[PDB]
């Protein structure tokens, strides 16, 4: 649909501009430096899977935006997979309800959407040009958040973490060595990474003016009144940034 095609394109463009503002680099630039990898307009076959293919249609527009030679197969599932390989797909892109993967058939590399999304959003946060300290707050330590937190620890940031699930908070503290954040004793941050399927997860007392909030979480961690009040630099996009991360990770 022509209306929806203008919509994702604009949404990706707006997300690109926001990343440029924060880091001085576009999404492509972030990916290339993150993975040390470059694209040659690889052929990517998107196969719809039963688990109406509007998702695969979004993926086509997203991959076209990033310059990939992408196509959606006529058939779904196993028949679609067969079709994709036969039509010379170098990378396979497909998702069920629990896993969204990219598989590079040439080099054997395979990416999972969840760690790839966490890593890139953490990466964008870590590359904030106007950051005044090495302190970073991570809210949400699940499938997306944990790999994000791990990436930040490896990049030598002082990582503060919180998750409403005490078991996951404890396990993140043990394995990663992050400082457990106490909502009862809050401090201000200039860099925040949220990976949570909930709203209003970032307390006001944690925000400083012009701080970066890098969040793949849906819905938004912050109310639009709070982001206006603190002039929050929001990095938030529903699918494209995570997808770019997957593709560049397997090149
Ligand atoms: N934008 C994208 O491209 C993209 C890609 C993948 C996933 N996502 C989204 O990212 C979000 C996280 O995904 P996930 O797979 O990590 O989910 P998950 O369930 O594995 O992890 C979410 C974690 O957040 C915690 N949490 C919930 N409410 C909280 C609160 N108020 N304070 C602190 N912690 C809280 C939960 O305990 C949970 O451990 C989801 O909304 C998902 O839809 C977005
Ligand atoms: Mg995204
Ligand atoms: Na959220």
């Amino acid at each position: 649909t022509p209306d929806d095609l203008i919509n994702i394109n604009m949404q990706l463009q707006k997300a690109d501009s926001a990343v440029q503002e924060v880091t001085g680099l576009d999404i492509k630039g972030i990916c290339k430096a993150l993975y040390g990898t470059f694209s040659s307009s690889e052929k990517v076959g998107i196969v719809p899977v039963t688990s109406i293919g509007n998702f695969s249609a979004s993926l086509h527009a997203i991959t076209q935006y990033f310059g990939f030679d992408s196509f959606v197969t006529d058939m779904p599932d196993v028949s679609g997979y067969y079709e994709a390989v036969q039509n010379g797909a170098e990378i396979i892109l497909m998702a069920d309800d629990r896993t969204f993967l990219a598989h590079n058939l040439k080099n054997g590399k395979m990416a999972n959407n969840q760690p790839c999304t966490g890593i890139i959003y953490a990466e964008i946060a870590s590359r904030y040009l106007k950051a005044d300290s090495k302190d970073v707050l991570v809210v949400g330590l699940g499938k997306v958040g944990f790999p994000g937190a791990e990436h930040l620890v490896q990049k030598d940031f002082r990582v503060y973490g919180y998750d409403a699930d005490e078991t996951l908070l404890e396990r993140a503290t043990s394995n990663l060595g992050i400082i457990p954040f106490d909502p009862a004793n809050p401090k201000k941050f200039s860099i925040i990474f949220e990976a949570t399927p909930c709203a209003n997860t970032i307390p006001e007392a944690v925000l400083s003016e012009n701080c970066v909030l890098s969040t793949p979480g849906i819905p938004c961690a912050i109310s639009e009144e709070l982001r206006d009040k603190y002039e929050v630099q929001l990095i938030a996009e529903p699918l494209g940034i995570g997808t770019a991360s997957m593709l560049y990770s397997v090149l």
Side-chain angles (χ1 to χ4, degrees), residues 38-187:
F38 66 95
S39 176
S40 304
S41 296
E42 283 73 20
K43 207 164 178 176
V44 18
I46 303 156
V47 14
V49 6
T50 306
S51 202
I52 298 163
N54 38 30
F55 177 77
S56 68
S58 300
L59 250 35
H60 185 255
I62 288 163
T63 53
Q64 288 289 319
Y65 178 87
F66 287 110
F68 290 95
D69 184 13
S70 65
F71 63 95
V72 180
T73 55
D74 292 330
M75 292 298 299
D77 300 313
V78 177
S79 295
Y81 181 93
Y82 189 92
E83 185 184 335
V85 175
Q86 197 172 58
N87 287 23
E90 296 173 301
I91 301 160
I92 305 289
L93 222 45
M94 61 187 181
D96 65 20
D97 56 1
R98 280 175 57 101
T99 307
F100 173 28
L101 68 77
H103 186 205
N104 192 145
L105 302 166
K106 294 189 291 170
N107 63 19
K109 287 176 189 177
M110 188 173 63
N112 190 297
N113 181 64
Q114 291 155 343
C116 287
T117 297
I119 292 167
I120 193 166
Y121 274 87
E123 176 72 359
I124 289 154
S126 75
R127 297 200 67 161
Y128 177 34
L129 256 21
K130 289 174 177 171
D132 47 34
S133 89
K134 220 154 67 159
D135 294 341
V136 56
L137 199 244
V138 179
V139 176
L141 296 159
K143 304 177 216 70
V144 175
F146 188 92
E150 182 172 42
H151 182 68
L152 290 164
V153 171
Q154 289 170 155
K155 286 194 83 190
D156 201 49
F157 279 80
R158 189 145 65 256
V159 185
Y160 292 80
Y162 182 72
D163 194 295
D165 182 341
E166 290 94 318
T167 308
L168 281 179
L169 181 56
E170 182 86 324
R171 278 156 56 182
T173 307
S174 297
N175 306 343
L176 261 32
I178 60 154
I179 304 159
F181 181 74
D182 184 12
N185 293 124
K187 79 194 208 79

Side-chain angles (χ1 to χ4, degrees), residues 12-13 69 87 94 123 190 194 224 234:
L12 288 165
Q13 208 170 136
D69 184 13
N87 287 23
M94 61 187 181
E123 176 72 359
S190 73
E194 189 265 36
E224 304 311 301
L234 221 215

